[PDB]
Ligand binder design. Structure first.
Ligand SMILES: CS(=O)(=O)NCCc1c[nH]c2ccc(OCc3ccccc3)cc12
Length: 199
């Protein structure tokens, strides 16, 4: 799973409507591990970078998701992001999304979501969230590249860092690093979740 004893990711998708096609999707063998030092360079060595955050800890909060996104779908159309987390504790969440292009942070989006009681547990729904202009434009350019290897080339410099903290205590609950390639249309979107380690 992508989660800890305290907070667990349930579903994550990015999509276009318009007024659904999913570019990437996580619905929910231990879990392979990746040494965080390998991806230090795909994120800023600045405040709120992978290096900085991992140093505070707890190490078990950190995950890598590699995405093979489906970009086969011209101008619409509702572009959106949906996340759903769950816990057994009642919290409010502060979710920070940092989009990075060549190590540098080009976008940060901070959102807050309160626990909702449902089915003997707390669910945190951040559904139908507008995709920022930057991502829409970027996707619209990327879909036009003639070769999937050129999308892969363009994507090797593009990463997202998602930091979920307990809004009242400032403790870190979940830190997911995203890295990207493209999938074909017959293979469909795919992902591989990893745990980040250092030892
Ligand atoms: C909520 S926000 O708009 O403020 N920022 C977005 C937050 C976000 C976290 N993880 C993601 C994974 C993928 C994605 O777009 C799909 C996709 C992107 C790039 C190439 C191919 C496909 C957006 C996100």
């Amino acid at each position: 799973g992508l989660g800890t004893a305290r907070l667990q990711l349930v579903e994550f998708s990015a999509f276009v409507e318009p007024p659904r096609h999913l570019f990437v999707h996580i619905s929910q063998p231990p879990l392979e591990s990746v040494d965080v030092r390998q991806i230090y360079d795909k994120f800023p060595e600045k405040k709120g970078g992978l290096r900085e955050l991992y140093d505070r800890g707890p190490p078990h909060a950190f995950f890598l998701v590699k995405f093979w996104a489906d970009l086969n779908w011209s101008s619409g159309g509702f572009y959106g992001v949906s996340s759903q987390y769950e816990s057994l504790e009642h919290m409010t969440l502060t979710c920070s999304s940092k989009v990075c292009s060549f190590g540098k942070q080009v976008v940060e989006k901070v959102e807050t979501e309160r626990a909702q009681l449902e089915d003997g547990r707390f669910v945190y729904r951040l559904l139908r969230s507008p995709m920022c202009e930057y991502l829409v434009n970027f996707l619209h350019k990327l879909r036009q590249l003639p070769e999937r290897y050129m999308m892969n080339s363009v994507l090797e410099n593009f990463t997202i860092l998602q930091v979920v903290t307990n809004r009242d205590t400032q403790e870190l609950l979940l830190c997911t690093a995203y890295v990207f390639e493209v999938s074909t249309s017959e293979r469909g979107a795919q992902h591989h979740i990893y745990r980040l380690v250092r030892d």
